[PDB]
């Protein structure tokens, strides 16, 4: 029977219901309030006792007449999943917002689910290669990996992600999930158009990507469960279809942010900065449901816009905890004109282990790191004085490092327009070779400008010829 | 010429505004102040019966 209630309170999008009936829904149950907007979906999050629950409202709030009929839909919101989720952009509710009509589904699955157990997990060791030189050198990705970004704005976040979609998702043939959490509608429209164009969404046929999109205009509460919906879609592929997937999640700072917004309203004492006291728990569930298990290997990409550019803030701090590899993206390096904007002293990967990428790769990387760290160390001295007041030995090192820095900029294909340079994807084997030579100063004898914003070592040589003219 | 013409209309309106205030003070003196309560009373009787 529908559990009838009245809306006792409407404090923001944290509506509180008082179920008149002695029946009381459990926590994480779902409720429908009939509205002239069709329905309003609310989700029980606390029971405040005396047959008065307190519910997060997952759809927009306004117009509500305080005291109005509720019916209990029960349990977590159950999305509809299937292989026919491919070729659909779905709302948090599950509505086909791309309006390709009803999503055929066999199983409708609860948004909330319990993270797979320690035992069930299978831990990969596969290398995934992007063809982005800087990624390859500094932080080799892994297939099934959890990849992480520390966002530029969209100016950096979208661009980085677009390159990844271009590379990885054409190097993947399995299922792929795009989950866009609190992102601008335009980015989605561009992506949707682009995906359709590159047939990744084939409409005549079927896609190979599925998309979940949550706009940044969406109410905070709605934004909170956009992620979980995606997490379920991923689970269906991971488990039920039992094939390797791919996943993109951006912007998961918004997930954190959304949580911080609702927490205060919920009544929770807000922890430092402002972040929710439940920051750790929420992060834990999210990041343990993307795990590579024996059921399936899901390469995941998570993108956190650095709050006010402070990495020390608790939200980035808890992000660092659940990343197989990280690639912090920094405004300074963007200002240096290096695209990608990756800090080269702030990238790490678990597969940066020497054996894993072979001693030669590791030795090359070691030398790059040492050289650049020296160069950063002498950034003070160079600036306070000149670079001609450097010790001669160091001055050579510095000149080499200046070249290395310029070398790191590679034009990117899906941003070829934006850069204004036709893109480049350079082989990993080539990358190791290229840096090795540079470290031995083989090609150090030709302009720093030649190294700048061009691809491989061969390209540098050719651009020296261009410059020579 | 058009601008000052509009200004004169505004000046006339504020002059007639202070005359409205003067008329209000006069109205509230009268035991029309008393007698019109009866008018409101019967009007409310008609009104609320029309509800």
């Amino acid at each position: 029977t529908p559990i009838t209630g009245k809306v006792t309170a409407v404090i923001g999008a944290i509506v509180d219901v008082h179920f008149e009936q002695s029946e009381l829904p459990a926590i994480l149950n779902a409720l429908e309030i009939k509205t002239p907007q069709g329905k309003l979906v609310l989700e029980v999050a606390q029971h405040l006792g005396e047959n008065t629950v307190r519910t997060i409202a997952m759809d927009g709030t306004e117009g509500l007449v305080r005291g109005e009929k509720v019916l209990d839909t029960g349990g977590p919101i159950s999305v509809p999943v299937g292989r026919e989720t491919l070729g659909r952009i779905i709302n948090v509710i599950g509505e086909p917002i791309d309006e390709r009509g009803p999503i055929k589904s066999k199983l409708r699955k609860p948004i909330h689910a319990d993270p797979p157990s320690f035992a069930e997990q299978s831990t990969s060791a596969e290398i995934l290669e992007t063809g982005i030189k800087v990624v390859d050198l500094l932080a080799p990705y892994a297939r099934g990996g959890k990849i992480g970004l520390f966002g530029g704005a969209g100016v950096g976040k979208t661009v980085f992600i677009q390159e990844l979609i271009n590379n990885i998702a054409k190097a993947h043939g399995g299922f792929s999930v795009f989950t866009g959490v609190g992102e601008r509608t335009r980015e989605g429209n561009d992506l949707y158009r682009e995906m359709k164009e590159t047939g990744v969404i084939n409409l005549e046929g079927e896609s190979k990507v599925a998309l979940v999109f949550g706009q940044m205009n969406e109410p905070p509460g709605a934004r909170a469960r956009v992620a979980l919906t995606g997490l379920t879609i991923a689970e269906y592929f991971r488990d039920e279809e039992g094939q390797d997937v791919l996943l993109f999640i951006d912007n998961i700072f918004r997930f954190t942010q959304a949580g911080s917004e609702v927490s205060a309203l919920l009544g929770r004492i807000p922890s430092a900065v402002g972040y929710q006291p439940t920051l750790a728990t929420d992060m834990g569930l999210l990041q343990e449901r993307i795990t590579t298990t024996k059921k399936g290997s899901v390469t995941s990409v998570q993108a956190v816009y650095v709050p006010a550019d402070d990495l020390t803030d608790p939200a980035p701090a808890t992000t660092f905890a659940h990343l197989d590899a990280t690639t912090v993206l920094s405004r300074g390096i963007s200002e240096l004109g290096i695209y990608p904007a990756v800090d080269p002293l702030d990238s790490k990967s678990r597969l940066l282990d020497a054996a894993v990428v072979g001693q030669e790769h590791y030795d090359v990387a070691s030398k790059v790191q040492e050289t650049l760290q020296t160069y950063k160390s002498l950034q003070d001295i160079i600036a306070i004085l000149g670079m001609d007041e450097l010790s001669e030995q160091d001055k050579l090192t510095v000149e080499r490092a200046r070249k290395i820095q310029r070398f790191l900029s590679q034009p990117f294909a899906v941003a070829e327009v934006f850069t204004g340079i036709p893109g480049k994807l350079v082989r990993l084997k080539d990358t190791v070779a290229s840096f090795k030579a540079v470290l031995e100063g083989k090609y150090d004898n030709i302009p720093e400008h030649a190294f700048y914003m061009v691809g491989g070592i061969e390209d540098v040589v050719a651009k020296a010829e261009k410059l020579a003219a | 010429w058009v601008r000052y013409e509009a200004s004169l209309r505004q000046l006339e309106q504020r002059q007639l505004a202070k005359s409205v205030i003067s008329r209000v003070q006069s109205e509230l003196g009268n035991p029309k102040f008393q007698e019109k309560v009866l008018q409101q009373s019967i009007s409310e009787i008609e009104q609320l019966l029309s509800k």
């Binding site: 306004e62 117009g63 429209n189 402070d310 204004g420 | -």
Partner: protein, 499 residues
């Protein structure tokens, strides 16, 4: 006359109806009132108090409702009767708001009497979905070189304008409105932006100067000004951008192109901070509440270039951010940057150091701006950003000896920078910007001595018109520089160089 209008108005007072009204004010002050009753009340209603002021119900609580007073607390007092308007906050929207200054209650502060407005529409309205959204194609032309070239600006986009206070902050935007006088006084409605200037938190005197300037350039007739001055109450200021955007959406939802400049959203942040604190909701970073992101993001994404289904309407947002010290990592600026497409960071140091207008080319980006550009302004402006980011590099390391390659770049670069500059409050025509950029790019301004650059510009334009305004008419209509035009222009420009 005045008697007849007043008499018509007096006649228009006629009887009060019974209905659910009346709450009684209790604890009041701190700009929120706690009212007893109002048992059935729609959420986010407008209530009008019998203190003759209106407020928006915020907190619907068991047994009490907490109105937020949209207006002065001075007249509100305990045990006053609060009457339900019965309606969610809506503001009149229509066509007749054009060329009318109004305040945030839509009261004509131009005082041209009652505004003609087709409808009223709810203050908060969700942004259109993915499906209604067509990628930008039409440009917005500001008439200022580099602000169209180096910074390519196109319709629908939320194109940020960030910079430091009172660097003639307003002027960049005013110039845009002025350049588009030409097109907006056009007959093609596809070439009609209806531009809305939202003035928030500015001195009423300053706004009056702005109004007077706009009426001096006779620009009032295609533009609306909404005003929520610094004196005007903070809850009114909070609702001020949202209301303006509703009006903008009526034009947009006529499928007609429009633009809205939100001056200054940073002051909305301070207002929302004030409001939040007075609602004693916990403060966020820099004491700006945690829903500040939600506030800006919900506002900003209502500005869009819709699809053909929606009649391809635009509502190009230009939001004006006031950075405290050029604090580009500051919470409010960064939050805005992440929402917005591009940045138009204005270089304050250069502004002071005689570059008017001063655009920090490095800190100016436009995410999808460049495909709004017309082909003439893609071809002519081809790689000029790179060249002047070679000038940026060149002058970086200029600070001893200069190789002839470097020197050549420096000589061009310095001179090109001079060319960018414009006289504040006097923008150039779009047509005119094409040759000027042509000249420098095609290296005609390489030789021109630095002292005569200003002369070169005026004389070059006069020359072009006198010699053959035919070329300019062609580039005006074609909007693409043909090979013949390119050669003809090379020849013509060289001809001007000679003189």
């Amino acid at each position: 006359e005045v008697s007849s209008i007043l008499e018509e108005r007096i006649k228009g007072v006629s009887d009060e109806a019974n209905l659910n009204e009346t709450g009684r004010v209790l604890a009041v002050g701190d700009g929120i009132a706690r009212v007893f009753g109002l048992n059935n009340i729609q959420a986010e209603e407008l209530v009008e108090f019998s203190s003759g002021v209106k407020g928006m119900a915020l907190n619907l609580e068991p047994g009490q409702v907490g109105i937020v007073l949209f207006g002065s607390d001075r007249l509100v007092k305990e045990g006053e009767l609060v009457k339900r308007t019965g309606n969610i906050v809506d503001v009149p929207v229509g066509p007749g708001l054009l060329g009318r200054v109004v305040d945030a209650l839509g009261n004509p502060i131009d005082g041209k009497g009652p505004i003609d407005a087709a409808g009223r529409s709810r203050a908060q309205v969700k942004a259109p979905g993915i499906l209604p959204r067509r990628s930008v194609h039409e440009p917005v032309q500001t008439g200022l070189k580099a602000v169209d070239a180096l910074v390519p600006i196109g319709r629908g986009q939320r194109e940020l304008i960030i910079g430091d206070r009172q660097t003639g902050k307003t002027a960049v935007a005013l110039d845009t409105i002025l350049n588009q006088k030409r097109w907006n006084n056009g007959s093609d409605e596809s070439k009609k932006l209806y531009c809305v200037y939202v003035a928030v938190g500015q001195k009423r005197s300053t706004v009056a100067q702005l109004v007077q300037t706009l009426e001096q350039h006779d620009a009032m007739k295609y533009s609306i000004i909404v005003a929520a001055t610094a004196s005007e109450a903070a809850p009114l200021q909070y609702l001020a951008p949202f209301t303006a955007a509703s009006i903008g959406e009526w034009f947009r939802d006529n499928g007609k192109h429009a633009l809205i400049v939100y001056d200054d959203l940073s002051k909305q942040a301070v207002a929302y901070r004030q409001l939040s604190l007075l609602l004693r909701r916990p403060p966020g970073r820099e004491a700006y509440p945690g829903d500040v992101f939600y506030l800006h993001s919900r506002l900003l994404e209502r500005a869009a270039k819709l699809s053909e289904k929606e009649g391809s309407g635009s509502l190009t947002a230009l939001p004006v951010i006031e950075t405290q010290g050029g604090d580009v990592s500051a919470y409010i600026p960064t939050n805005v940057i992440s929402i917005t497409d591009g940045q138009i960071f204005l270089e304050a140091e250069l502004f002071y150091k005689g570059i008017r207008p001063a655009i920090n080319v490095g800190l100016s980006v436009s995410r999808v701006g460049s495909a709004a550009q017309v082909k003439a302004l893609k071809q002519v402006a081809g790689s000029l950003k790179l060249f002047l980011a070679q000038y940026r590099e060149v002058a970086a390391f200029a600070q001893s000896d200069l190789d002839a390659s470097t020197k050549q770049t420096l000589v061009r670069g310095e001179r090109l920078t001079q060319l960018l500059k414009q006289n504040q409050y006097s923008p150039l025509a779009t047509e005119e910007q094409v040759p000027l950029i042509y000249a420098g790019v095609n290296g005609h301004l390489d030789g021109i001595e630095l002292s005569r650059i200003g002369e070169f510009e005026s004389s070059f334009l006069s020359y072009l018109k006198s010699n053959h305004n035919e070329l300019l008419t062609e580039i005006r209509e074609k909007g693409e520089l043909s090979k013949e035009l390119l050669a003809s222009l090379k020849s013509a420009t060289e001809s001007f160089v000679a003189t």
